[PDB]
Ligand binder design. Structure first.
Ligand code: CHL
Ligand SMILES: CCCCCCCCCCCCCCCCCC(=O)OC[C@H](CO[C@@H]1O[C@H](CO[C@H]2O[C@H](CO)[C@H](O)[C@H](O)[C@H]2O)[C@H](O)[C@H](O)[C@H]1O)OC(=O)CCCCCCCCCCCCCCCCC
Ligand code: CLA
Ligand code: CLA
Ligand code: CLA
Ligand code: CLA
Ligand code: CLA
Ligand SMILES: CCCCCCCCCCCCCCCCCC(=O)OC[C@H](CO[C@@H]1O[C@H](CO)[C@H](O)[C@H](O)[C@H]1O)OC(=O)CCCCCCCCCCCCCCCCC
Ligand SMILES: CCCCCCCCCCCCCCCCCC(=O)OC[C@H](CO[C@@H]1O[C@H](CO)[C@H](O)[C@H](O)[C@H]1O)OC(=O)CCCCCCCCCCCCCCCCC
Ligand SMILES: CC(/C=C/C=C(C)/C=C/[C@@]12O[C@]1(C)C[C@@H](O)CC2(C)C)=C\C=C\C=C(C)\C=C\C=C(C)\C=C\[C@@]12O[C@]1(C)C[C@@H](O)CC2(C)C
Lengths: 198, 154, 42, 193, 97
């Protein structure tokens, strides 16, 4: 019992439940190759973590501002508000910082354990974990990287990715954020759906 | 503007063309009963013609000295709707088609009588394969990186 | 039935049905979004 | 290593002064091209290490920038200026041909040698202080040289592309306008206008 | 400006360069490039009587082998650039910054 996305359908051979969150869901045969699968598990993890952070920062501030604690703009507007620095300045800053961190992560994906150690201080390396979940300093509270815990992260990350898809499509066709959408729907549900939206 | 062309909405020849077009159809509507089938059909196409000219005006097309909406393909971002986004859509659809065909050819290449499955399509296998075209770009990228898209040995 | 299913998948008939479906689809698409010289949504 | 976690090219062990295994285009695959490449890299590095102080310190003084300082020649009555003095032999043709045959003689004299190590490190009349006495203090001097030289090449290409970004300005002027407001005067506005 | 001053000076400089600077380089290059050949033989060894090198006028009494044809070549270069200098120095042209 490795979980089944479609109860009556068997699971693919390349998927064997070894990876956390494996429910036998690959209809398009995207990972029939082992190296493709190894790359895609990392892709899913990083996309999902970014989506978690993203829709957290997209939605939680919105309800915080709509119950009268802070006053933040809408996510689809917050870029236009001007900050202490130019926007292009922030962009190139982020570009240089992200280029070094992503390159590091890439070098470990291609050859695991080759970039574990600090390049400046030759002590302070990382414990030999496994690609995708880099422990050590990236795990201060030192939680147990248990299999069930890894599955929870994969489960949440997929939900956050779908939530982000929903956020952007909702704002594109509706014209407002997520929380306004939800409260305006649950206000009068039978007359506030997509049908009335479209 | 670009290439000396002018925004059709503000051009005069573009309007003159619209009025002339609309004019001739109106003449065809006349000499028949005011609310007849043919007359109703002529009216329909008149409204359709007015909608097409207004749609052209709204989309911000470029009109020359003849008033015909010219298309810019240099890459100017004010004009990606004319060639480049339709081009990306086409490339997607054509890659879909070609990848599905190639997938099928590879899958049937292993039987003893492979020509039998070419003059007579295995439609169950084909329907199993058609929807991989949806992800064909990622699959083809990873196949090129793998080195299995292009046959070695040749 | 089995043989009728086979014959209905021979190359000429498979391709005529495919192209008739494609023609119907394109015809309806241009019946709903007529006179389209560009992609005006985004 | 130029990129931890990346295998080294076989022909680049790490003994040559300055070898950090950087060769993504595999240009030094054939050894007799690698010899000439080491020579040419050292020549470039030396020229730029000499040039960048010459780009910066006259503009640091009350003279024009490196491109303003070479545009009198674009005008017919061109007359040079050193330290605020009109040099006598200052017109364009005198300058041009004296420079031409000077450099041509010395450059031919240079490539008329077939060591090929003295090709890069000739020494003798070019080593008055005689820092080449200890074969390993010599080696780490070599390392320091090519390191500073790569830095200077980087600095020079940066200078000239900055010039192409803000035409009619000097590198120290760019440093000044950056220090005037660091969070608003950066490369951002030249990448995203 | 004084045309003869410039012509003589420039061709003298070109000849000085050819005899004292680029002589060895040109000599070794002309040696390593060799005589033109057809089917492995030089043009004279294939039956062409007119393609025989003029060994009489080519030998010289110069300490290094400077002879008539190379003074011809170097001096002609000197004259070419001398006339370029003259022509462009009085064409009165001017670009603009
Ligand atoms: C990483 C994802 C990312 C996404 C999805 C967006 C999405 C958006 N940004 Mg944004 N940005 C993103 C990152 C960044 N932006 C900015 C800086 C800006 C600015 C300065 C502006 C935007 C704006 C916009 C919006 C453009 C209008 C539109 O299409 O509305 C549908 C849009 C919703 C514009 C905006 O706020 O429009 C209202 C805008 O003016 N962004 C920075 C920092 C430099 C980013 C860094 O990652
Ligand atoms: C909106 C946000 C969320 C989006 C979520 C989207 C999810 C993907 C879209 C739809 C998912 C449900 C699809 C319909 C339900 C049943 C699909 C199925 O299990 O139907 C069965 C197939 C099975 O897929 C794969 O099929 C492959 C080949 O099997 C067979 O493939 C063919 C299937 O007829 C032939 O039988 C062929 O002979 C045989 O090789 C593999 O080898 C595996 O068996 C199997 O994983 O899935 C299929 O693609 C069926 C055909 C439709 C696939 C659609 C994929 C997505 C587009
Ligand atoms: C023949 C010469 C030439 C060429 C080659 C180009 C090329 C280009 N011009 Mg230009 N132009 C030219 C002449 C030319 N121009 C002239 C003479 C003028 C003066 C009139 C202009 C004026 C001009 C302007 C004003 C602009 C351009 C722009 C552009 C760029 C638009 C496309 C783009 O942004 O990238 C590509 C766009 C994408 C969305 C990338 C998606 C494509 C995908 C990745 C490929 C799809 C493949 C497949 C589906 C999937 C991959 C499969 C594979 C992995 C196997 C493009 C690179 C625009 C620009 O600056 O670009 C920003 C623009 O603003 N041009
Ligand atoms: C970048 C997003 C992303 C990526 C890279 C992956 C990657 C992966 N998923 Mg997955 N998943 C995602 C999002 C993603 N997922 C979301 C949002 C959901 C919620 C519906 C799920 C739900 C899900 C289930 C239930 C299962 C997987 C599984 C898998 C693995 C096998 C399937 C596969 O390799 O296909 C390749 C995946 C891609 C090529 C992503 C491309 C995104 C498409 C092509 C574009 C989006 C189109 C959109 C509709 C508009 C694989 C490593 C199976 C598994 O075994 O777990 C490991 C499994 O059973 N996923
Ligand atoms: C699996 C289908 C398939 C694929 C992937 C390709 C791919 C390719 N073809 Mg090709 N071709 C095909 C079918 C296919 N072809 C057929 C059926 C014919 C007979 C008319 C040709 C005749 C042909 C010629 C004469 C040339 C190519 C060329 C090429 C290459 C350049 C792209 C191009 O110009 O194509 C052009 C496409 C066509 C001329 C017509 C395509 C026919 C349809 C659209 C494809 C058929 C799909 C199939 C029936 C669907 C079955 C799926 C299954 C589920 C039932 C490219 C790699 C060119 C080349 O050599 O590149 C350098 C070239 O000169 N093709
Ligand atoms: C095979 C491709 C194809 C596709 C995708 C469609 C799609 C469509 N057809 Mg169409 N049709 C086709 C082939 C196709 N047709 C062929 C081969 C013929 C024979 C000539 C017709 C003849 C036809 C007629 C006469 C009508 C349609 C209508 C419609 C639209 C349904 C609108 C409606 O009635 O209310 C909505 C339906 C639902 C909500 C369910 C729809 C989008 C109808 C229409 O658009 O109204 C004017 C209509 O009257 N079709
Ligand atoms: C690659 C090395 C290099 C080059 C090509 C130049 C080239 C130049 N320098 Mg410069 N310089 C250099 C290195 C260099 N410098 C260094 C290392 C320093 C620090 C000591 C200086 C300090 C310096 C000053 C202070 C000035 C120049 C000036 C000049 C310009 C006129 C020089 C002249 O009058 O003829 C040569 C003069 C004699 C041989 C005597 C000229 C384009 C002048 C200038 O800026 O022009 C406006 C000037 O004021 N230089
Ligand atoms: C976006 C548009 C541009 C996309 C560029 C995609 C990357 C292209 C370069 C990489 C190509 C590649 O890896 O395969 C390159 C392919 C062969 O592919 C090679 O196959 C080998 C044997 O299977 C190995 O698997 C290598 O990892 C693989 O790269 O051949 C080439 O394209 C020649 C270029 C040099 C390689
Ligand atoms: C049109 C439907 C054709 C149905 C068909 O051919 O299968 C039904 C059968 C083919 O089916 C065969 O039938 C045989 C006995 O008739 C045997 O039972 C075989 O086992 C069976 O496969 O063909 C027909 O009977 C149709 C005759 C022509 C009808 C037009
Ligand atoms: C990363 C991501 C979003 C990141 C968002 C961020 C950072 C938002 C940041 C900001 O908000 C803040 C914080 C503050 C705001 O003021 C500003 C912005 C800038 C707005 C979404 C990913 C979103 C990713 C999505 C939606 C992925 C969908 C993938 C799907 C559906 C694939 C399904 C299948 O692949 C399987 C699983 C199996 C295959 O065989 C078949 C198919 C069907 C293909």
């Amino acid at each position: 019992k490795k979980g089944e996305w479609l109860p009556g359908l068997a699971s693919p051979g390349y998927l064997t439940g070894s990876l956390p969150g494996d429910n036998g869901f690959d209809p398009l045969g995207l990972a029939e190759d082992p190296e493709n699968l190894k790359w895609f598990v990392q892709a899913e993890l990083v996309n999902g973590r970014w989506a978690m952070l993203g829709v957290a920062g997209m939605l939680l501030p919105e309800v915080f501002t709509s119950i009268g604690i802070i006053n933040v703009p809408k996510w689809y507007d917050a870029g236009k508000e001007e900050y202490f620095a130019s926007s292009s300045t922030l962009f190139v800053i982020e570009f240089i910082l992200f280029h070094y961190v992503e390159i590091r992560r890439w070098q470990d994906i291609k050859n695991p354990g080759s970039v574990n150690q600090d390049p400046i201080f030759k002590q302070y390396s990382l414990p030999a974990g496994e690609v995708g979940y880099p422990g050590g300093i990236f795990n201060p509270l030192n939680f147990a990287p248990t299999l069930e815990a890894k599955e929870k992260e994969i489960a949440n990350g997929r939900l956050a990715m779908l939530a982000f898809l929903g956020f952007i499509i909702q704002h594109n066709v509706t014209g407002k954020g997520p929380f306004d959408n939800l409260l305006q729907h649950i206000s009068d549900p039978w007359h506030n759906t997509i049908v009335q939206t479209l | 503007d670009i290439a000396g062309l002018t925004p059709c909405k503000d051009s005069k020849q573009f309007a003159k063309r619209e009025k002339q077009s609309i004019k001739k159809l109106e003449s065809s509507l006349k000499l028949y009963a005011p609310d007849s089938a043919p007359a109703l059909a002529i009216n329909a196409t008149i409204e359709k013609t007015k909608r097409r000219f207004d749609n052209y005006g709204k989309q911000g097309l470029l009109c020359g000295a003849d008033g015909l909406p010219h298309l810019i393909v240099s890459g100017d971002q004010r004009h990606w709707g004319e060639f480049i986004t339709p081009g990306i859509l086409f490339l997607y659809i054509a890659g879909w088609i070609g990848w599905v065909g190639r997938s099928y050819l590879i899958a049937i290449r292993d039987d003893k009588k492979p020509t039998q499955k070419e003059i007579i399509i295995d439609v169950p296998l084909a329907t199993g394969l058609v929807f991989r075209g949806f992800s064909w770009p990622i699959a083809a990228y990873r196949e090129l990186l793998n080195g299995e898209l292009v046959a070695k040995d040749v | 039935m089995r043989d009728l299913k086979t014959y209905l998948s021979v190359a000429p008939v498979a391709s005529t049905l495919w192209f008739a479906a494609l023609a119907g689809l394109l015809i309806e698409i241009n019946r709903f979004f007529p006179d389209a010289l560009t992609f005006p949504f985004f | 290593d130029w990129m931890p976690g990346q295998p080294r090219p076989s022909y680049l062990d790490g003994s040559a002064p300055g070898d950090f295994g950087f060769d993504p285009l595999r240009l030094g695959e054939v050894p007799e091209n690698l010899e000439r490449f080491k020579e040419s890299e050292l020549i470039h590095c030396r020229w730029a290490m000499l040039a960048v102080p010459g780009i910066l310190v006259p503009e640091a003084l009350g003279l024009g920038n490196w491109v303003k300082a070479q545009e009198w020649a674009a005008l017919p009555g061109g007359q040079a200026t050193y330290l605020g003095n009109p040099v006598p032999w200052g017109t364009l043709p005198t300058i041009l041909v004296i420079e031409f045959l000077s450099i041509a003689f010395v450059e031919h004299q240079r490539s008329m040698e077939k060591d090929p190590e003295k090709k890069k490190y000739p020494g003798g009349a070019f080593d008055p202080l005689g820092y080449s006495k200890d074969p390993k203090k010599f080696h780490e001097y070599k390392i320091k040289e090519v390191k500073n030289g790569r830095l200077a090449l980087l600095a020079f290409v940066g200078i000239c592309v900055q010039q192409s970004a803000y035409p009619g300005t000097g590198p120290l002027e760019n440093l000044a306008t950056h220090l005037a407001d660091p969070w608003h005067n950066t490369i951002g506005n030249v990448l995203i206008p | 400006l004084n045309p003869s001053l410039v012509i003589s000076l420039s061709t003298g400089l070109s000849l000085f360069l050819g005899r004292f600077v680029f002589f060895n380089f040109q000599r070794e290059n002309v040696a390593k490039q060799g005589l033109p050949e057809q089917n492995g033989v030089t043009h004279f060894e294939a039956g062409d009587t007119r393609a025989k090198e003029y060994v009489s006028l080519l030998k010289s009494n110069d300490p290094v082998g400077f002879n008539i044809v190379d003074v011809l070549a170097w001096g002609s270069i000197g004259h070419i650039v001398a006339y370029y200098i003259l022509a462009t120095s009085s064409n009165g042209y001017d670009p603009k910054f």
